[PDB]
Write an enzyme that holds these catalytic residues in place. Structure first.
Site, short mmCIF file in Angstrom:
data_model
loop_
_atom_site.label_atom_id
_atom_site.label_comp_id
_atom_site.label_asym_id
_atom_site.label_seq_id
_atom_site.Cartn_x
_atom_site.Cartn_y
_atom_site.Cartn_z
N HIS A 42 -3.87 7.95 8.35
CA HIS A 42 -3.26 9.22 7.94
C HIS A 42 -4.28 10.38 7.87
CE1 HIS A 42 0.54 7.27 6.45
NE2 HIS A 42 -0.29 6.24 6.39
N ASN A 45 6.35 6.66 3.25
CA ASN A 45 6.37 6.95 4.71
C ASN A 45 7.78 7.43 5.09
OD1 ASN A 45 3.66 6.21 5.17
ND2 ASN A 45 4.16 4.26 6.16
N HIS A 49 -2.84 7.57 -4.37
CA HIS A 49 -3.02 6.09 -4.36
C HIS A 49 -1.82 5.52 -5.16
CE1 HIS A 49 -4.91 2.17 -4.71
NE2 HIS A 49 -4.66 2.19 -6.01
N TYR A 84 -6.76 1.83 -2.17
CA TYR A 84 -6.80 3.28 -2.39
C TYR A 84 -7.85 3.78 -3.41
CZ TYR A 84 -2.33 3.48 0.13
OH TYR A 84 -1.34 3.42 1.07
C1 HDE Z 1 4.62 2.55 2.01
C2 HDE Z 1 4.02 3.85 2.42
C3 HDE Z 1 2.69 3.29 2.84
C4 HDE Z 1 2.42 1.85 3.00
C5 HDE Z 1 3.35 0.66 2.89
C6 HDE Z 1 1.04 1.85 3.33
N1 HDE Z 1 0.41 3.13 3.45
FE1 HDE Z 1 -1.57 3.47 3.29
N2 HDE Z 1 -3.51 3.81 3.20
C7 HDE Z 1 -4.53 2.90 2.85
C8 HDE Z 1 -4.47 1.58 2.95
C9 HDE Z 1 -3.19 0.91 3.07
C10 HDE Z 1 -3.10 -0.47 2.93
C11 HDE Z 1 -4.28 -1.33 2.58
C12 HDE Z 1 -1.66 -0.77 3.16
C13 HDE Z 1 -0.95 -2.10 3.10
C14 HDE Z 1 -1.93 -3.16 2.76
C15 HDE Z 1 -1.07 0.46 3.40
N3 HDE Z 1 -2.00 1.51 3.51
C16 HDE Z 1 0.33 0.63 3.72
C17 HDE Z 1 -5.85 3.55 2.54
C18 HDE Z 1 -6.85 3.19 3.65
O1 HDE Z 1 -6.31 3.07 1.27
C19 HDE Z 1 -5.53 5.04 2.53
C20 HDE Z 1 -6.41 5.86 3.50
C21 HDE Z 1 -6.81 7.14 2.79
C22 HDE Z 1 -6.44 6.87 1.35
O2 HDE Z 1 -6.70 7.59 0.38
O3 HDE Z 1 -5.73 5.63 1.24
C23 HDE Z 1 -4.08 5.10 2.95
C24 HDE Z 1 -3.49 6.28 3.23
C25 HDE Z 1 -2.03 6.51 3.14
C26 HDE Z 1 -1.43 7.86 3.00
C27 HDE Z 1 -2.17 9.16 3.00
C28 HDE Z 1 -2.12 9.85 1.64
C29 HDE Z 1 -2.55 11.27 1.93
O4 HDE Z 1 -3.70 11.61 1.60
O5 HDE Z 1 -1.77 12.06 2.52
C30 HDE Z 1 0.02 7.55 2.92
C31 HDE Z 1 1.24 8.43 2.78
C32 HDE Z 1 0.05 6.17 3.02
N4 HDE Z 1 -1.13 5.51 3.11
C33 HDE Z 1 1.34 5.48 2.96
C34 HDE Z 1 1.44 4.04 3.04
#
Ligand code: HDE
Ligand code: HDE
Ligand code: HDD
Ligand SMILES: [S]
Ligand SMILES: [S]
Ligand SMILES: [S]
Lengths: 726, 726, 308, 83
Positions: free
Chosen positions: A101, A174, A365, A388
């Site tokens: 993202h 999402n 997070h 997160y």
């Molecule tokens: C349900 C909506 C959803 C789901 C099921 C997941 N993501 Fe996301 N994600 C990160 C890791 C992560 C894991 C380990 C899993 C399932 C095991 C999901 N995702 C599924 C992250 C790497 O920790 C993340 C990257 C940057 C951050 O701060 O956390 C991450 C991002 C992220 C965003 C972005 C938030 C933003 O700054 O706009 C969103 C909307 C999701 N994930 C949704 C999401």
């Protein structure tokens, strides 16, 4: 003074429609908009008018055009601290982007519930219809870098930070109700597979490559979210016109300690709407910032993005009442089985001031919950909880990332944690530990209770061995994909077929295509054969005879899964291209714009050059863009007024504008001689549904066109478009 | 788990003598002490009383005693976000320590000049005797880590951050007027040589090892600051009792554009005083925090550290008038040649709240100057300008270190710099570049001028070829060491001999010791012979025939180089140990305390156990520490009142306490039967200068003791201490 | 075994034209292409076939499909060190992108002089035509992020790291012979003006916005490089079909210490060629990876990029 | 991650295993190992799924946790047995 004498450098600080003024930082554009979080960021806002230029140390700079050198053609001297401070800060501007993202666009707003939900949750932000909660919302793609394009085919993220009086709650969702995989342990595998391949770092913002379709072909659990991604859900028209979902079963916890299972929903009040693939792809070229631009301009116009929060609620005793596992994040809960209960409204009404400071630095997070909410054992959510917090230590430089202004709670926060890089808070507590006597044990623990109490986890029963094992109850992969497919209209189904067919055509190893076709034959034979035909693959007799998967709790479709089956059109904030000529009929243009204004629809006046033109009656018409400069990709309908049609009748760009809009299923309106353009898109003299035409632009000309806009696109036109070379 | 009912957990918020109350954060100890900088930190000071314990996200914690687990003897669960946040913050507390000066102790205060200096400098903070400038000062050692001991033999740092109205000025000086090396390019070679050796990382806080003496023997330019380090200047009694120096020639620039060369001085108003080596070394074990503690307790007591800023001023036309190069930082300017002109007074009057947030993260850098000041081509200063900005990028985590609260200017700062890790300031400026029209070019450059002008460098003429070459005028290494040696008293000279002899005795490779003794023979034959003798080395005939270096512009000595030659004692803030017995003569103690109080001298009441003893008149005397717990190292003088002397006459610790004090040249006073202790330290009946004795503690007895304390130590006793086994 | 029977998952390790085979890491595609630098990297190259899946600590993993949980529908356990190491590495994959030239595509090669230049320079790598110097070259745009599009209108970078016997020499050039500004002190002003604007971070990969043209209109020194950017120089067909320039006067110094002023050039032996604007812009949407792909595939095909 | 600058701290020479290590993890600050595997995920067919999981066994087997029985409610509670 460098600013022009007439003040035309400064955007009006009032709502204005897209293109009418240059865009501006939010607090300058809309100084009168406020909420509790915006007010609390004031201590770090920095202005600029009437101030001297200084170093970071507050030393006034005299000459910001030159380095210090020994003679005016001499070497630069090491003692030039003003140069090195300025170049050092530049040298270190960038921070790691988000692992996933990385591309996203954000706005401030507020949330308010319709009524108190205290019977089902003790969460303070949901306890009183008068309680208003500031939010910060970031929408994103998933695969591409922070510098990738907006209108890619991808899942979209929809993350909301609620600044509640009992802590930050982040609802990190999402635009589809499920995910590709079941257990968080596989997250790096699926992500590596969809991401650019590691030898050459291609392709950007696309799942259309070998490793993605390899993983999918080997992991049928992915098929449900792949169906969503291959449908038009994968290419939304705007962040304002997509659904949001919380992905997992969480819990609500009331004051009596009762748990209710919950899945979160966001309903777009501007309705559901997506592009078509050829348009979305070409738009990544013409304007890779289209969604970021659309959101910012919607807010500057007063077309505030609005979403209704809703809950699907399942009692604890109903945990095992479905054909699927509530904890399986590849399964959706059909709304035919568990309706969405409306909860409140969120309005996004202010853009940030500085994109880096507020957007790039914001950390969301899903472990950030508040008393009244709790988790479940969904094994994808479970591992999210680890990720997160962890990822911020590199991305935002250490464990004081909650002191970055946008991340700060508005609620009080006091504890015994100290130090770390960047530390802002200067703690005066004589104690940095508890229990302590030297500060009478403050700050103190707080028992749980109905309001303002400490967090206690719901005492769920846990029983079993320590295993690395997938629940057998998760081991069904096709029934949900099938329900999704069957729930789509015929034209939505065709776009799904075309999504798979195009993506698999970019897979270089044919066996991977064959394998994915086999998986589709497990979902629906019609879908499978249709894809197969586009790839030159013939289904085996065994493939032809695969038994379709069972229906889901007796359902053979659920219309809430379709973007379009049930009309929910809204035209406010949509945009029309108006194609000008060098002598427009003024009476047509008056009638066009009057009717557009009354429904809150924007217009852009296009011509073959910039500057102005003059109507039949002397009216000076300013031009916004050239035909090439603001392509039909960027608008929802095209209207061509009467006048000197000969001016633009042999203009390649003007003709092509109508051809592209026609191909992409957009409403087109031609008045008087502008009907000469019917030849270019092969329209018969008696006319066709989706092309509005008349001697002049009223009586019912604009009503017709606006009715077509409310239906978004002219799906009936699909069988005519293949004939058109555009 | 709470505070005692009697309120005894909380220190009075009033000035109190050392040991009378627990120490506390400055803002709680002295809440009424303010200055503009201290107030501007209020945005980030965080209290604690009456507040709920929370996560960093503002969620209240119910149970801060336990991890979430499945059953009360079960495994800890990954969903325990409260545990993980808490542990994650802890796991990332430490930041890199400073490459040099990692060990340091700091306080807040203020500065004001005595008179306007506008004839010689346009610097705003020196322009008006009534403009008060807030300061934050950090004192440091050089070699050891942040957890190394205070009373090591080392140079001390003395860095002052002035928060002026025209920007931050940092005067980053040391407690000797020169440095070991001439060119910054050599800094990493010298610092590596003095630091713990790379194979085994030994020794901490000490130059007494082979690599340092190797480098010195090979780089005679180091010998001047070596002489200072080996003298008692290397072991100050207190940060309040050492001089400070700016180390380089800088420039003052007046409104007319006239440049004057300047060297900066700080004169301690508490006078100059040092430890003796055996005492300093033993005190690194008994209280490795002695200087840190003494500074903090002096400020809590109201014995505010005061320093007079002083300038040596040399007109531009006088640049070449000495027999050394002004720009050579291994050369001092003798005060006999260029007097120090008094400029103003600095008072440190408040401790910080949180050592990490304010002390450890403070960033000082000598390139932080303001209009009215400028640099010179000193080749050591030149390279420092690069390092102090560069090193912050790893130490403080990026280019936004000025936004760390302690580092923020109180003067306005506005510029076009953006982003970087943990960016706090949210810029609203539509422009992030200049020249710009879109913000009418704000913030704007400011021409230089008499006051509030932009910084412009003095237009020094540069003529020469691009060379890596040391100036021939820097190639003289022995005359300043010699001037220093000859200016010391005979006892100071003995201490220098003993410092070299002790240090070289710990050099394992004997040729290194020999080479250092050969260098010493180039400075002074008497010094060289005395060191040789202690090392069992015999000087050669040639060594005996080395011509002494020339006088420094005709000087045979300069008494301002000595710590003690010209009396400047101040007893206020000093401390006496009073050794109790179980029936103190209350009349002795009354007169003792009354006389000490009159001169601002503190007392610590010591005994063979803790608790209380009761005096002859019923007065209950609380005991500060045992004889062993607070040794004579930590005090300036020892008094033994009369009473039941038999109680302590045969106490081994009480006896040793006097032997140690005696050995270390401290005044000792014995009343009534306490005169029995004369036998332990072998004083003849007639008495001895430095031992005060009488039938009782009276007017005369305390006056004599106080006169001895004003002279710091009893140097005449040195011949008699060889014999004492202590 | 998951690979197909017929071995068609693995690209032939022989030159093949674009699209004939899947692309591959260079040591697998062309194992026998060697130079001193490529060989010296062998100590860090890590293979994969026939090796067990492990943690970073060398512990073999049995089940890489699941987290450890208390029952098969239970909560994930904190003691699952395999999951946490795997997710920790993932969570920290990204490093800051370059402040400018974040988007770029790179390849290994070598350089050889035509003749000894000792009369004008003592640089060892130019001393004999037999001196073969390994290089690593990175071509780039300037303004957009690492995930931005290739065929934008922008200046391109052309940076060459020469691994000489007397040290690394980096020739860090662009595809026009000048720059926009005169003094380094203005570089953050110019770069901020061209980059996405700070309120909303638009536009990506484009100078077509108010702040850039604002700066240009106020700084006429910029106009020369602006002419180049606005020409078809700003939209090359291929990194193989553009020129390079060292942008500055440097000096050569010979054994006698005589200094000669020099400006550096790279002449593309494939000739000069650019796109047209409509085509470049549409191409950013149809294949934002076009120049990265084209370079990789030219090399895989034996169409090695050559510059004099 | 802060002390040693990132997730590749196992590539710091003293920390390196002498046992083989191969997996699908990639990148991070200070990355030393240059992975030649066409695949950076599993399951994959394009590298025949290498490197591969290994069943537990008596020697040279993959790690499997002992299947300890867990039973209780989700609680933040000290065991009475520890009092
Ligand atoms: C349900 C909506 C959803 C789901 C099921 C997941 N993501 Fe996301 N994600 C990160 C890791 C992560 C894991 C380990 C899993 C399932 C095991 C999901 N995702 C599924 C992250 C790497 O920790 C993340 C990257 C940057 C951050 O701060 O956390 C991450 C991002 C992220 C965003 C972005 C938030 C933003 O700054 O706009 C969103 C909307 C999701 N994930 C949704 C999401
Ligand atoms: C003429 C060739 C050229 C010129 C004249 C400049 N750039 Fe470049 N640039 C960096 C800073 C910088 C400054 C301060 C100036 C003028 C004062 C120039 N540029 C003009 C940089 C921020 O330090 C940079 C970013 C990452 C990095 O390592 O250095 C940087 C990058 C860069 C590249 C990319 C090389 C690569 O990493 O592939 C190229 C080809 C140039 N610059 C060319 C260049
Ligand atoms: C070119 C390298 C170099 C040179 C030649 C010097 N310094 Fe330095 N100094 C540094 C490079 C440095 C540094 C590496 O930048 C430090 C530690 C990290 C810090 O912020 O700066 C530092 C810290 C430092 C401090 C500690 C400030 C604090 O409390 O945080 C003081 C007092 C001095 N120096 C004093 C001096 C004096 C009197 C010098 C003789 C003129 C001198 N330094 C030369
Ligand atoms: S999800
Ligand atoms: S110095
Ligand atoms: S350049």
């Amino acid at each position: 003074s460098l600013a022009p004498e007439d003040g035309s450098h400064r955007p009006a600080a009032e709502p204005t429609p897209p293109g009418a003024q240059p865009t501006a930082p939010g607090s300058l554009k809309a100084p009168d908009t406020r909420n509790e979080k915006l007010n609390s960021l004031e201590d770090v806002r920095k202005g600029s008018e009437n101030y001297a230029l200084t170093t970071n140390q507050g030393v006034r700079i005299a000459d910001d055009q030159n380095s210090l050198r020994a003679g005016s053609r001499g070497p630069t001297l090491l003692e030039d601290f003003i140069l090195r401070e300025k170049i050092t800060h530049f040298d270190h501007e960038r921070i790691p982007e988000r692992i996933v993202h990385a591309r996203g666009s954000a706005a401030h707003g507020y949330f308010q519930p319709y009524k108190s939900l205290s019977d089902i949750t003790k969460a303070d932000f949901l306890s009183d219809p008068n309680k208003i909660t500031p939010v910060f919302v970031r929408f994103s793609t998933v695969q591409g870098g922070a510098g990738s394009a907006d209108t890619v085919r991808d899942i979209r993220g929809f993350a909301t930070k609620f600044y509640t009086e009992e802590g930050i709650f982040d609802l990190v969702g999402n635009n589809t109700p499920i995910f590709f995989i079941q257990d968080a342990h596989k997250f790096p595998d699926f992500v590596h597979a969809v991401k650019p391949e590691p030898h050459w770092a291609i392709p950007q913002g696309q799942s259309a490559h070998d490793t993605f379709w390899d993983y999918v072909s080997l992991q049928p659990e992915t098929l449900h979210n792949v169906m969503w991604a291959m449908s038009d859900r994968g290419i939304p028209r705007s962040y304002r016109t997509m659904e949001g979902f919380g992905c997992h079963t969480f819990r609500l916890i009331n004051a009596e300690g009762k748990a209710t299972f919950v899945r979160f929903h966001w309903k777009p009040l501007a309705g559901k709407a997506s592009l078509v693939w050829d348009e979305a792809q070409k738009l990544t070229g013409r304007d890779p910032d289209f969604h970021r631009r659309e959101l910012w301009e919607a807010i500057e116009a007063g077309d505030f993005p609005e979403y209704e929060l809703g809950f699907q609620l399942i009692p604890e005793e109903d945990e095992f009442k479905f054909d699927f596992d509530l904890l399986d994040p590849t399964k959706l809960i059909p709304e035919e089985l568990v309706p969405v209960q409306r909860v409140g409204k969120m309005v996004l009404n202010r853009n940030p001031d500085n994109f880096f400071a507020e957007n790039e630095q914001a950390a969301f997070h899903p472990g950030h919950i508040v008393p009244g909410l709790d988790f479940t054992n969904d094994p994808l959510l479970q591992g999210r909880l680890f990720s997160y917090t962890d990822t911020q230590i590199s991305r935002l430089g250490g464990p004081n990332f909650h002191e970055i202004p946008i991340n700060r709670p508005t609620a009080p926060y006091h504890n015994f944690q100290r130090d770390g890089m960047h530390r802002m808070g200067i703690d005066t507590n004589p104690a940095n530990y508890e229990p302590n006597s030297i500060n009478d044990n403050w700050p103190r623990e707080t028992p749980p209770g109905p309001k303002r109490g400490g967090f206690e986890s719901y005492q769920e029963r846990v029983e079993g061995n320590k295993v690395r094992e997938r629940s057998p109850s998760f081991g069904e992969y096709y029934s949900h994909p099938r329900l999704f497919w069957l729930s789509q209209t015929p034209f939505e189904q065709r776009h799904i077929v075309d999504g798979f067919s195009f993506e698999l055509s970019k897979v270089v190893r044919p066996y991977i295509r064959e394998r994915v076709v086999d998986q589709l034959a497990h979902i629906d034979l019609t879908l499978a054969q249709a894809v197969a035909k586009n790839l030159g693959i013939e289904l085996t007799d065994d493939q032809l005879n695969i038994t379709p998967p069972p229906d889901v709790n007796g359902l053979k479709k659920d219309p809430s899964l379709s973007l379009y089956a049930i009309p929910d059109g809204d035209v406010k904030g949509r945009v029309v291209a108006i194609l000008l000529n060098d002598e427009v009929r003024s009476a047509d243009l008056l009638a066009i714009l009057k009717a557009l204004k009354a429904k809150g629809v924007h217009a852009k006046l296009l011509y073959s050059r910039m500057g102005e033109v003059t109507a039949d009656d002397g009216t000076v018409l300013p031009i916004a863009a050239t035909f090439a400069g603001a392509p039909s990709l960027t608008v929802d309908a095209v209207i061509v007024p009467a006048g000197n049609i000969a001016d633009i009748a042999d203009n390649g760009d003007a003709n092509y504008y109508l051809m592209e809009a026609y191909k992409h299923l957009k409403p087109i309106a031609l008045a008087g001689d502008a009907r000469k353009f019917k030849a270019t898109i092969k329209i018969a003299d008696q006319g066709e549904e989706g092309i509005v035409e008349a001697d002049s632009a009223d009586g019912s000309f604009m009503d017709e066109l606006l009715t077509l806009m409310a239906a978004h696109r002219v799906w009936s036109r699909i069988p005519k478009i293949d004939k058109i070379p555009a």
